[PDB]
Amino acid sequence: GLFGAIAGFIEGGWTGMVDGWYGYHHQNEQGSGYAADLKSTQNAIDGITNKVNSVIEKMNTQFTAVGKEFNHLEKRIENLNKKVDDGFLDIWTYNAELLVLLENERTLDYHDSNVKNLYEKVRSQLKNNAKEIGNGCFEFYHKCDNTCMESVKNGTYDYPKYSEEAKLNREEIDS
Amino acid sequence: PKVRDQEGRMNYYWTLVEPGDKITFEATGNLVVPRYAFAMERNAGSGIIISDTPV
Numbered sequence: 232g233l234f235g236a237i238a239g240f241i242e243g244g245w246t247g248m249v250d251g252w253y254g255y256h257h258q259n260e261q262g263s264g265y266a267a268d269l270k271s272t273q274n275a276i277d278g279i280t281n282k283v284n285s286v287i288e289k290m291n292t293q294f295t296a297v298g299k300e301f302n303h304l305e306k307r308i309e310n311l312n313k314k315v316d317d318g319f320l321d322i323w324t325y326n327a328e329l330l331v332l333l334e335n336e337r338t339l340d341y342h343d344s345n346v347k348n349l350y351e352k353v354r355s356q357l358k359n360n361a362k363e364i365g366n367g368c369f370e371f372y373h374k375c376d377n378t379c380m381e382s383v384k385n386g387t388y389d390y391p392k393y394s395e396e397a398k399l400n401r402e403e404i405d406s
Numbered sequence: 407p408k409v410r411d412q413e414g415r416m417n418y419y420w421t422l423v424e425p426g427d428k429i430t431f432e433a434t435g436n437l438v439v440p441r442y443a444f445a446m447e448r449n450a451g452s453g454i455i456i457s458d459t460p461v
Contacts (some may be wrong), residue, residue: 296453 232343241367242345247258252342254274257380266384268349275345279338286334356388360397372397372404 232239248254251267252275297316301309350367361369373396375383382388407413416438423429431439 274437298453298455300454318450 233340234343234347236347236350237339237343239343240365241350242363253346255384257375257376259375259380261379268384271349271359278341281336282334286330293336293357308347339354356383356386356390358390360390360393372400 232332245256245265247253248256248265248267250265251269251272252266253271254267256265257263291353299309299312301312357369357371360373361371364370373393375393379388379393418438424450425460433439
């Protein structure tokens with residue numbers, strides 16, 4: 232996608248993460264499971280919600296009766312009335328069709344952007360304490376218990392606390 | 407030409423008399439006079455649906 236994450240370097244989705252649009256999967260010694268990122272999800276929900284209401288509510292039509300009646304000697308104005316109706320028909324149809332197409336595209340990109348940013352936000356925290364193993368996963372160079380994992384999801388990961396352990400395992404693994 | 411067996415014709419006319427105004431009819435023949443007329447208040451503008459759809 233526009234930003235390369237969804238259907239990109241994160242190849243597929245998670246039917247197991249049911250509580251949010253974007254989120255996290257972890258596996259450590261004490262367990263494994265999914266957790267939605269609640270903040271980024273709510274924010275995205277707020278954006279799309281606002282978008283839907285805009286497309287719907289900015290249309291404020293008045294009370295009208297479309298039909299018009301003309302006698303057999305009023306064909307010219309009957310064709311004018313039809314030209315009006317057909318002109319309106321053509322416009323709304325073109326504009327609605329393109330509108331939906333354009334915003335659907337903008338919507339998918341948006342999700343794509345959001346995932347990338349989440350991934351980047353974690354990478355920026357983890358730095359050299361983990362290995363980017365592709366497909367959106369980071370493999371930690373140190374033991375990460377449930378407390379540690381949560382700090383990452385909450386954005387308070389302590390890089391210096393684990394940097395030593397990681398450096399040992401990083402230069403050990405890289406021989 | 408005979409329509410519904412008639413070679414004659416009847417033209418139908420209408421007007422809206424304002425409150426307080428008088429309308430006068432004068433004739434020496436050929437007048438289909440009103441018998442019932444209609445007091446009414448027109449509201450805005452609707453239209454006429456021509457359909458078999460049931461009410």
